[PDB]
Write a protein that holds these residues in place. Structure first.
Motif, PDB file in Angstrom:
ATOM      1  N   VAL A   2       0.767  -1.188   0.000  1.00 52.81           N
ATOM      2  CA  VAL A   2       0.000   0.000   0.000  1.00 52.81           C
ATOM      3  C   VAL A   2       0.843   1.306   0.000  1.00 52.81           C
ATOM      4  CG1 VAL A   2      -2.159  -0.977   0.835  1.00 52.81           C
ATOM      5  CG2 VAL A   2      -0.240  -0.641   2.428  1.00 52.81           C
ATOM      6  N   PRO A   3       0.166   2.468   0.166  1.00 55.23           N
ATOM      7  CA  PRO A   3       0.847   3.753   0.181  1.00 55.23           C
ATOM      8  C   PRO A   3       1.815   4.032   1.317  1.00 55.23           C
ATOM      9  CG  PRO A   3      -1.409   4.081   0.792  1.00 55.23           C
ATOM     10  CD  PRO A   3      -1.292   2.672   0.247  1.00 55.23           C
ATOM     11  N   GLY A   4       2.601   5.075   1.077  1.00 50.14           N
ATOM     12  CA  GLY A   4       3.557   5.631   2.003  1.00 50.14           C
ATOM     13  C   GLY A   4       4.090   6.958   1.472  1.00 50.14           C
ATOM     14  N   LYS A   5       5.010   7.533   2.238  1.00 50.16           N
ATOM     15  CA  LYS A   5       5.679   8.774   1.887  1.00 50.16           C
ATOM     16  C   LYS A   5       7.179   8.529   1.960  1.00 50.16           C
ATOM     17  CE  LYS A   5       2.360  10.157   5.398  1.00 50.16           C
ATOM     18  NZ  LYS A   5       2.175   8.728   5.831  1.00 50.16           N
ATOM     19  N   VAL A   6       7.923   9.243   1.126  1.00 50.62           N
ATOM     20  CA  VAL A   6       9.372   9.232   1.216  1.00 50.62           C
ATOM     21  C   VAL A   6       9.918  10.610   0.850  1.00 50.62           C
ATOM     22  CG1 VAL A   6       9.952   8.383  -1.135  1.00 50.62           C
ATOM     23  CG2 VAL A   6      11.415   7.786   0.850  1.00 50.62           C
ATOM     24  N   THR A   7      10.547  11.268   1.818  1.00 48.49           N
ATOM     25  CA  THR A   7      11.186  12.552   1.558  1.00 48.49           C
ATOM     26  C   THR A   7      12.674  12.397   1.212  1.00 48.49           C
ATOM     27  OG1 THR A   7      11.988  14.565   2.650  1.00 48.49           O
ATOM     28  CG2 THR A   7      10.924  12.924   4.033  1.00 48.49           C
ATOM     29  N   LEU A   8      13.039  12.925   0.040  1.00 50.27           N
ATOM     30  CA  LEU A   8      14.385  12.796  -0.517  1.00 50.27           C
ATOM     31  C   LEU A   8      14.893  14.168  -0.871  1.00 50.27           C
ATOM     32  CD1 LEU A   8      12.860  10.341  -3.090  1.00 50.27           C
ATOM     33  CD2 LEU A   8      14.650   9.429  -1.545  1.00 50.27           C
ATOM     34  N   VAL A  56       2.816  14.768  -4.328  1.00 53.52           N
ATOM     35  CA  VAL A  56       4.090  15.434  -4.038  1.00 53.52           C
ATOM     36  C   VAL A  56       3.912  16.506  -2.961  1.00 53.52           C
ATOM     37  CG1 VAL A  56       3.950  17.150  -5.894  1.00 53.52           C
ATOM     38  CG2 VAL A  56       6.175  16.504  -5.018  1.00 53.52           C
ATOM     39  N   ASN A  57       4.724  16.434  -1.908  1.00 54.30           N
ATOM     40  CA  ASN A  57       4.650  17.391  -0.786  1.00 54.30           C
ATOM     41  C   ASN A  57       3.235  17.601  -0.255  1.00 54.30           C
ATOM     42  OD1 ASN A  57       7.416  17.697  -1.089  1.00 54.30           O
ATOM     43  ND2 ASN A  57       7.353  19.906  -1.475  1.00 54.30           N
ATOM     44  N   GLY A  58       2.570  16.509   0.114  1.00 52.67           N
ATOM     45  CA  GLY A  58       1.228  16.564   0.698  1.00 52.67           C
ATOM     46  C   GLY A  58       0.141  17.010  -0.260  1.00 52.67           C
ATOM     47  N   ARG A  59       0.442  16.965  -1.560  1.00 51.96           N
ATOM     48  CA  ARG A  59      -0.491  17.392  -2.598  1.00 51.96           C
ATOM     49  C   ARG A  59      -0.680  16.312  -3.657  1.00 51.96           C
ATOM     50  NH1 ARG A  59       0.519  22.545  -6.566  1.00 51.96           N
ATOM     51  NH2 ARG A  59      -1.454  22.442  -7.737  1.00 51.96           N
ATOM     52  N   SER A  60      -1.929  15.896  -3.838  1.00 45.71           N
ATOM     53  CA  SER A  60      -2.256  14.844  -4.789  1.00 45.71           C
ATOM     54  C   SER A  60      -2.078  15.314  -6.229  1.00 45.71           C
ATOM     55  CB  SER A  60      -3.674  14.319  -4.561  1.00 45.71           C
ATOM     56  OG  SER A  60      -3.942  13.205  -5.391  1.00 45.71           O
ATOM     57  N   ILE A  61      -1.749  14.366  -7.090  1.00 41.55           N
ATOM     58  CA  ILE A  61      -1.306  14.651  -8.437  1.00 41.55           C
ATOM     59  C   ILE A  61      -2.298  14.097  -9.461  1.00 41.55           C
ATOM     60  CG2 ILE A  61       0.147  12.943  -9.708  1.00 41.55           C
ATOM     61  CD1 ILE A  61       1.112  16.155  -7.655  1.00 41.55           C
ATOM     62  N   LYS A  62      -3.334  13.439  -8.950  1.00 40.67           N
ATOM     63  CA  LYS A  62      -4.419  12.888  -9.748  1.00 40.67           C
ATOM     64  C   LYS A  62      -5.013  13.964 -10.674  1.00 40.67           C
ATOM     65  CE  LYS A  62      -4.704   9.273  -8.065  1.00 40.67           C
ATOM     66  NZ  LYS A  62      -3.842   8.049  -8.261  1.00 40.67           N
ATOM     67  N   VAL A  69       3.643  17.238 -13.305  1.00 38.90           N
ATOM     68  CA  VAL A  69       4.117  16.593 -12.087  1.00 38.90           C
ATOM     69  C   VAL A  69       5.630  16.703 -12.003  1.00 38.90           C
ATOM     70  CG1 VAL A  69       4.136  14.463 -10.745  1.00 38.90           C
ATOM     71  CG2 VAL A  69       2.098  15.117 -12.019  1.00 38.90           C
ATOM     72  N   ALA A  70       6.298  16.559 -13.139  1.00 39.68           N
ATOM     73  CA  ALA A  70       7.739  16.731 -13.199  1.00 39.68           C
ATOM     74  C   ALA A  70       8.103  18.166 -12.894  1.00 39.68           C
ATOM     75  CB  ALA A  70       8.264  16.333 -14.547  1.00 39.68           C
ATOM     76  N   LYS A  71       7.341  19.105 -13.440  1.00 45.95           N
ATOM     77  CA  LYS A  71       7.551  20.521 -13.156  1.00 45.95           C
ATOM     78  C   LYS A  71       7.456  20.787 -11.644  1.00 45.95           C
ATOM     79  CE  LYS A  71       5.375  24.516 -14.258  1.00 45.95           C
ATOM     80  NZ  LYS A  71       4.571  25.504 -15.037  1.00 45.95           N
ATOM     81  N   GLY A  78      15.264  22.122  -2.495  1.00 48.12           N
ATOM     82  CA  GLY A  78      15.735  21.336  -1.348  1.00 48.12           C
ATOM     83  C   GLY A  78      15.153  19.929  -1.303  1.00 48.12           C
ATOM     84  N   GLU A  79      14.447  19.625  -0.212  1.00 46.56           N
ATOM     85  CA  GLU A  79      13.847  18.305   0.016  1.00 46.56           C
ATOM     86  C   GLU A  79      12.473  18.176  -0.624  1.00 46.56           C
ATOM     87  OE1 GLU A  79      15.513  16.440   4.076  1.00 46.56           O
ATOM     88  OE2 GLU A  79      13.643  17.580   4.251  1.00 46.56           O
ATOM     89  N   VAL A  80      12.222  17.033  -1.248  1.00 43.43           N
ATOM     90  CA  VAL A  80      10.925  16.785  -1.842  1.00 43.43           C
ATOM     91  C   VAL A  80      10.378  15.480  -1.284  1.00 43.43           C
ATOM     92  CG1 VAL A  80      11.807  15.626  -3.918  1.00 43.43           C
ATOM     93  CG2 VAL A  80       9.643  16.935  -4.051  1.00 43.43           C
ATOM     94  N   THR A  81       9.103  15.486  -0.916  1.00 45.13           N
ATOM     95  CA  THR A  81       8.470  14.275  -0.389  1.00 45.13           C
ATOM     96  C   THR A  81       7.471  13.714  -1.385  1.00 45.13           C
ATOM     97  OG1 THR A  81       6.598  13.859   1.196  1.00 45.13           O
ATOM     98  CG2 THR A  81       7.958  15.827   1.608  1.00 45.13           C
ATOM     99  N   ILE A  82       7.626  12.417  -1.613  1.00 46.46           N
ATOM    100  CA  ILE A  82       6.958  11.705  -2.679  1.00 46.46           C
ATOM    101  C   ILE A  82       5.994  10.696  -2.077  1.00 46.46           C
ATOM    102  CG2 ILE A  82       7.450   9.930  -4.463  1.00 46.46           C
ATOM    103  CD1 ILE A  82       9.869  12.168  -5.059  1.00 46.46           C
TER     104      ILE A  82
END
Length: 108
Positions: A2-8, A56-62, A69-71, A78-82
Motif C-alpha cells: 500500500v501507500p507511504g511517503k518518502v522525503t528525498l 508530491v509534498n502533501g499534494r495529490s497529483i491525480k 508533475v515533473a515541473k 531542497g527536500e521533496v516528499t513523494i
C-alpha cells in the motif's frame, strides 16, 4: 502493498533519480518507470519501478500530466516528499512491462 511517503533531497543537479511515466492509452495514474543507481532515490531504496506516484509534498497529483508533475518536483527547492502506492505485483514484471515500447516518461 500500500501507500507511504518518502522525503528525498535533490542532488547537485536538481535530481531525485526517477523517471515518472506511463503508456499512451488513458490511465488514471502515473508510475515510477525507472530508478537510477547513482541517485538519492536509489540510495534511499524505498521506491521501485512499478510503484505509483500519488502525490508530491502533501499534494495529490491525480489529474495532472507527467510534465506538470515533473515541473512540480523540478520546482521544489531542497527536500521533496513523494507519495506513492507500493504495488503488490512481482516487481520484476512491474519493471518488465514498464520497459516498453511506447512508454513515455519524464526524468526528475
Amino acid at each position: 502493498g500500500v501507500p507511504g511517503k518518502v522525503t528525498l533531497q535533490k542532488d547537485a543537479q536538481n535530481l531525485i533519480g526517477i523517471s515518472i511515466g506511463g503508456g499512451a492509452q488513458y490511465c488514471p495514474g502515473l508510475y515510477i518507470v525507472q530508478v537510477f543507481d547513482n541517485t538519492p532515490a536509489a540510495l534511499d531504496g524505498t521506491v521501485a519501478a512499478g510503484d505509483e506516484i500519488t502525490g508530491v509534498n502533501g499534494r495529490s497529483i491525480k489529474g495532472k500530466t507527467k510534465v506538470e508533475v515533473a515541473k512540480m518536483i523540478q520546482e521544489v527547492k531542497g527536500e521533496v516528499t513523494i507519495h506513492y502506492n507500493k504495488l503488490q505485483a512481482d516487481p520484476k514484471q512491474l519493471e518488465v512491462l514498464f520497459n516498453g515500447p511506447g512508454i513515455e516518461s519524464v526524468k526528475i
